[PDB]
Design a protein around this ligand. Structure first.
Ligand SMILES: CC[C@@]1(c2ccccc2)C2=C(CC(C)(C)CC2=O)Nc2n[nH]cc21
Lengths: 17, 347
């Protein structure tokens, strides 16, 4: 369950980097 | 009822359970339960009545929390009583003090005028909020829904009262709790990461969000969703370190997150924002939950020094509300802080 959340977060942060 | 008088056998919210007849009139629906406004016949005082379905096999969690509390900055449970519905249906009715305004409504007045709440009110409101949090936290009770909408405000006296304990719970170390709690803008980051072993410091994060919002004129972390909430936090504070993440939830060790630099903390707020307000905000909005100030430490912060000035007065020419009637319960996390908290002129 962390795996699903973290993968989503990593993509959203790459969209702002 | 509407213009009928309703008489019920109701238990006073404090003291032993000895119910007595209570009469009220003028019921009007205000808004998972139903909330009414009413008037007590004996005194004419306005009350709010929260009515929720209650199964007979267990005691209402909110009711059991409310009956423990007696504090000038927490909405008073005047009475509670039970009423009926569907076959064998029973409603619990919580009779609470009615306060006409909230911090949400008052702050929204300044936002629409494109203006900022004068900082004396920020000090007064946040100080009373931190007092209420110190009090409830001393019982192990976490409110879990701190937000401007749950901060009752008497604009004439500047008294603030914490309300809506429907999300509150006694936190016990070792017993899991639900992570999707708190209103999104005010939700602590460890909850967003899905922690179930969190503590009362989630309320301190929420209070930090309230303080930032009062200084800014709008929510500081307006997330579109749970994940976007964290993205908004990161855009201001920068990416949490691997260490801070472990302190929030220890289940993210196989992940490396993109590194976003923190915004310059002073540039977050308007140019003339008092530096002590910014310093207090930075010690509330900490990723690591144990790094946050306790509510009692927040009360003692330098930002509230003006409230301890013997010559301080409200902008309406009235005296400040009660600020120093601390109890042993309220002081229990750090009793020596009373040396700062209670000024000599208040003894
Ligand atoms: C009557 C219910 C109310 C409330 C209930 C839950 C959260 C916050 C406030 C409430 C108001 C005034 C209001 C904000 C205009 C409408 C409203 O919901 N005053 C109160 N005093 N005690 C409880 C309340």
């Amino acid at each position: 369950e962390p795996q699903k959340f973290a993968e989503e977060l990593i993509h959203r942060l790459e969209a702002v980097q | 009822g509407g213009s009928k008088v309703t008489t019920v056998v109701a238990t006073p919210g404090q003291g032993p359970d000895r119910p007595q007849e209570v009469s009220y009139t003028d019921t009007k629906v205000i808004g998972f339960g139903v909330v009414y406004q009413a008037k007590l016949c004996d005194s004419g005082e306005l009350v709010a009545i929260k009515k929720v379905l209650q199964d007979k096999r267990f005691k209402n969690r909110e009711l059991q929390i409310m009956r423990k509390l007696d504090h000038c900055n927490i909405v008073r449970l005047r009475y509670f009583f039970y009423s009926s519905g569907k076959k064998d249906e029973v409603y619990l009715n919580l009779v609470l003090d009615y306060v006409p305004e909230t911090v949400y409504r008052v702050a929204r007045h300044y936002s629409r005028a494109k203006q900022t709440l004068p900082v004396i009110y920020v000090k007064l409101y946040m100080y009373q909020l931190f007092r209420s949090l110190a009090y409830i936290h001393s019982f192990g009770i976490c409110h879990r829904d701190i937000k401007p909408q749950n901060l009752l405000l008497d604009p004439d006296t500047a008294v603030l009262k914490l309300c809506d304990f429907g999300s509150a719970k006694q936190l016990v170390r070792g017993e899991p709790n639900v992570s999707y709690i708190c209103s999104r803008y005010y939700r602590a980051p460890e909850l967003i990461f899905g922690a179930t072993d969190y503590t009362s410091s989630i309320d301190v994060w929420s209070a930090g969000c309230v303080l930032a919002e009062l200084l800014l004129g709008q929510p500081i972390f307006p997330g579109d969703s749970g994940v976007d909430q964290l993205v908004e936090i990161i855009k201001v504070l920068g990416t949490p370190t691997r260490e801070q993440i472990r302190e929030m939830n220890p289940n993210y060790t196989e992940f490396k997150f993109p590194q976003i630099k923190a915004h310059p903390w002073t540039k977050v707020f308007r140019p003339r924002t008092p530096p002590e307000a910014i310093a207090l905000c930075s010690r509330l909005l900490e990723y690591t939950p144990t790094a946050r100030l306790t509510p009692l430490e927040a009360c003692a912060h330098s930002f509230f020094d003006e409230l301890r000035d013997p010559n301080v007065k409200l902008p309406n020419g009235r005296d400040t509300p009660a600020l120093f009637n601390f109890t042993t319960q309220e002081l229990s996390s750090n009793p020596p802080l009373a040396t700062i908290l209670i000024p000599p002129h208040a003894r």
